[PDB]
Amino acid sequence: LKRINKTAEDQFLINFKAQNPNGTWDEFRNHEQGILYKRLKQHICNDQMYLCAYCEIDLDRENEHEIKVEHFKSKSGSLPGGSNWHLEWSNLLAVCLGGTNTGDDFELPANLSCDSYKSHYEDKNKINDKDWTGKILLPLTLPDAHNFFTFEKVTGKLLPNESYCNTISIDGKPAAETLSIVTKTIEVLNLNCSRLNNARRKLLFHFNNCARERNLRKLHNLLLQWNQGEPKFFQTTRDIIIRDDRICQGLLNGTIRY
């Protein structure tokens, strides 16, 4: 889920909170119209480089209607006088549509992923306490170089790991049981669904077609395109593929050079 860094507020989410202590998200959307909502979406997406926090896919840069904003701690869990979990600018994330367009509540659970299957899980197993912080990975406070995810090249699934899961701790939990946190993070959002396991398996196709030529220069060009900056879609899986190839790893650290 990468590691997204937020910069600062722009004194326009401050004024709305100042004029209205309690939080109702639909009130913010149905404000003086699109202006504030447009600019909040823009400023949120630019911090994420126009990518989704949960499932790394390319959000359209010229069509808002394909861009949605998801509250990490669900907006159904706000408590009067307890918290303001609708407008704090540390719970806002930019997410895709998740396999649905109108939210009819009659779409297949297996297809739904990224963000909507979070709500589906909450309804299905009746998660009363919407305090996901601690059980599902937060794409705002993770380590910047995570060895969490192993790319199973057979089916394209993202699977837990033994190493690096008993070393680092998240949300103050004991570091000896982060494996359960990662497994539930996979389960709640279904990063391992059909429409993403059959989309991450084609980056492997690209990486292996850029190696048919048996030319190390083309592989060099591929590495400097996939590991330069301005993250593109599915950047995490890109990094896993580069890290699982010993020729590539050797190229980036001396031995085996052109």
Partner: protein, 481 residues
Amino acid sequence: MEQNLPSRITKLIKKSESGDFASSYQLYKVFGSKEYGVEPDEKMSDYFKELSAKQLEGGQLRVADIHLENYKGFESLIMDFSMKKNSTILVGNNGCGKSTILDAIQKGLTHLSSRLSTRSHNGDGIEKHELRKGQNYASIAINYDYMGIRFPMIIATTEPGYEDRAKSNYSGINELGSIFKTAHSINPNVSFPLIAMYTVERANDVSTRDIENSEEIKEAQIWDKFKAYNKSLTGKADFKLFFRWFKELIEIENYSVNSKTLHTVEDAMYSFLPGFSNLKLQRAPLDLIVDKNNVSLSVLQLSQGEKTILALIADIARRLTLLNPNSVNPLDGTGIVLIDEIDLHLHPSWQQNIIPRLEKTFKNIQFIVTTHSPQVCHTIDSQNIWLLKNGQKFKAPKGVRGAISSWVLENLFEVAQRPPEDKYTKLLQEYKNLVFSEKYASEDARKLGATLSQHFGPDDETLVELKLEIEKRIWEDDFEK
């Protein structure tokens, strides 16, 4: 002011005075009685109903929603059809229930047909065999849409010996029948809503074997508008009366009706059937003649798919021409045509064009249909494909229109793209495991790779990808040593 409030009445009646049909119907819903703040005045309400009778020009009788409780395998399922896309397709597994909804809609229309025809009898209720085992009541609540006013209808049956709870309030079908009867009264040349139903038994009617002996030619069938609904809400269609119709029209051809209706009906199957032209009758042995690519064949040995697609569109066109009076475009009227099992005796090159051809030929017709072949499915948007499963409705995944057959299978029909237990696909899975498991070329991957290469050839897509993987990994063993 006539002592009545002139504000809301004038707000909602200006379009009615202009000619809008919905506003007059809305007025004659509360003006006559006392249900809204309007006084119980019966002058303007009756004038409005009489005027609204003569305001229907272009509309569409369409089923909007259906609500079933304990009807046939369904505990509760509330459909919501489309008022913009004129095609709804139901998809699912045989056993979940699709003919249940089709039969419910047919039962609903069995009373509307009687209400619109000259008769006034009732249709059919819920039979004893159409109640769930260990259950006491059932309901077939259905609503309809004319030019824009909702019209309800409930057909419910309860066992007297257990409980008496449900009712049967037909209601709006009587009002619709009143509108159409008054429309006929003012002018007999007025279009009527078609109603049709086509079960899996359409095939068992097409035969010109002793028409004189069998039926429907030894009579004096008067060709009118009200009685065109004969056997319309049943299974097998009407081909013998079809042949009677050709006989009469061609023989009278020898004014304008012969040149118009016969030509249009011919063009229907001329467009649907690619290569069947120059229809004509046979007089001595009393059969039909078709010219398939300039060779003449009767209707007793044509292809079964051609037979079915002939009878289907032929019946639809015949009833549309009978229900409609003198008009330039007589196949563009209105109706609710239910066609169970559209993918019946058809080739995968016609299943991808059956629906667009139906919509381009008959424009303003609703086509609630059930299918079981993906090629039919991915010709229509996902918003109009229901995936009835385990007694509850799930809508089709996003982006079905213009998709591929394998994806439609996997993500909508719950069927694996490759065969599930074919020995070669299991060998393919074992090969795919061995390639990615850091154990290639250990005398057990090469034999299996050769075995799969001998069957699919060296050109199968997936095998080429595994070959790319093994080639790249054998590259790795070079520079690391």
